Amino acid sequence: GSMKIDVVTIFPEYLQPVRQSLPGKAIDAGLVDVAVHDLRRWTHDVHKSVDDSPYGGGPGMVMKPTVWGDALDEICTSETLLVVPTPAGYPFTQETAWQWSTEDHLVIACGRYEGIDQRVADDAATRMRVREVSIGDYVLNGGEAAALVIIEAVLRLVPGVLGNALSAQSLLEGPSYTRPPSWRGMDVPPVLLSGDHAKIAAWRAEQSRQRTIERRPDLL
Amino acid sequence: SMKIDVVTIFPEYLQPVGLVDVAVHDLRRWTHDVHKSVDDSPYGGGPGMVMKPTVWGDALDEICTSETLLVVPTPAGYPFTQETAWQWSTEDHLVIACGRYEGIDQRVADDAATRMRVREVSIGDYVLNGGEAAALVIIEAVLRLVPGVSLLEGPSYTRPPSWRGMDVPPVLLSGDHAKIAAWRAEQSRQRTIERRPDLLGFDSP
Ligand SMILES: N#Cc1c(-c2ccc3ccn(C[C@@H]4CCCN(Cc5ccccc5)C4)c3c2)n[nH]c1N
Ligand SMILES: N#Cc1c(-c2ccc3ccn(C[C@H]4CCCN(Cc5ccccc5)C4)c3c2)n[nH]c1N
């Protein structure tokens, strides 16, 4: 019904699209709150260091456990769902989005560089639910774009939060058409204007089958 | 060198965003009538509205050339993967057509395909409210590969060597490159089998 989301990142400005997406009515009805925190608030030194060289060598730096530990200590409780984007994560899917849409408090820990010292998530997992997840099989610069995707996929399932409706309606969806009935020599498929709604449903099912075979045979 | 143009009715969403440039275009600028919406009801019925091909056609005609790669985010697309990102990294010009509502009339992609290369793609098996988040993801994955710009990664550690009573795995402190490479390989294997068995040719859970 309602959800608080905290995002922790060294680039809080990158979360701006979430602010752009939130309707005033959802916030005012106390259905949702999204806070974004600069990780550097929890640094210890004058140079505001968030990263350090990896033990055992390697490319790039690793984010410091003492900084992340302090941040999450302040922001999380035992009731928090701690979400950690990572390309080494479990797959984030629509099932995941449905499961998380009923949560009361999500905290999303956005990494950069070569990620966060593993002890941060391992320690957190001894007193809260922790989920390392990936939004897809490509490489990003950090967790922030993944946070945008996760927040949208989850909040659109919370009634009234993003302004979208949830329709009554596995296989891929087939093609959709609207006015005008003819455009650049292409007519809308006549069956859609036939008023035979059993035939229309069969036509759409076959379109879905063909599209799935062509684009996502893994689903069959 | 790459130009990316993004076309959207929600340009406000996309402004986190020399070898590369990215421009965002408001689709509504190409409207045929200010008092008319870009969306209409679906032929044959359905949930939700569909974006009309007319406004899209006018916008894309102005922005694209025959050399353009037209990218259309859609949950019903081919999978967008790292191999896709490598393939697109050497393109001169990407145009990303972001839909909203229940999507874009199919004739937009079908007509464009008669004059340029078109790619309908999905960034993952979850549902979004529109193509803009997908556009951000595609841009990020592709731009980091532009010239001049199998297994899951195991865990990483940095200082201090003991933290809250949790020790960095001793092998990582050993200086022994061969033992470290072996331990890391074993960690990656274990992680991949548990989290992404599909990558190693096994059944998903
Ligand atoms: N979800 C998701 C993602 C992410 C994602 C998520 C979080 C971070 C933090 C840093 N990076 C960027 C590096 C750049 C170099 C290579 N690897 C190194 C790395 C390996 C293992 C763990 C952390 C980093 C990613 C991230 C990427 N990418 N793709 C997805 N579907
Ligand atoms: N890439 C990518 C995407 C997108 C994406 C991309 C482009 C558009 C344009 C519009 N939408 C939103 C629609 C898309 C389809 C139908 N549902 C409505 C629906 C409502 C109720 C019950 C079932 C379904 C929403 C888009 C979503 N989503 N996930 C990805 N990996």
Describe the protein:
Chain A: Residues 206-218 have a biased composition (Basic and acidic residues). The structure is a homodimer. The first copy, chain A, is an alpha/beta fold and 220 residues long. Chain A has one domain (3-156): 3-Layer(aba) Sandwich (Alpha/beta knot). Helices cover 30% and strands 20% of the residues of chain A. The first copy, chain A, is built from seven helices and nine strands, in the order E-H-H-E-E-E-H-E-H-E-H-E-H-E-E-H. The first copy, chain A, has helices at 16-21, 24-28, 65-75, 94-100, 118-124, 144-155, 197-215, and strands spanning 3-9, 32-38, 51-52, 62-63, 81-91, 105-109, 129-134, 182-183, 186-187. Chains A and B meet through helix 1, strand 3, strand 4, helix 3 and strand 5 of A and strand 3, strand 4, helix 1, strand 5 and helix 2 of B. One ligand JEQ is lined by residues 85-89, 111-112, 114-115, 134-136, 138-143, 146 of chain A.
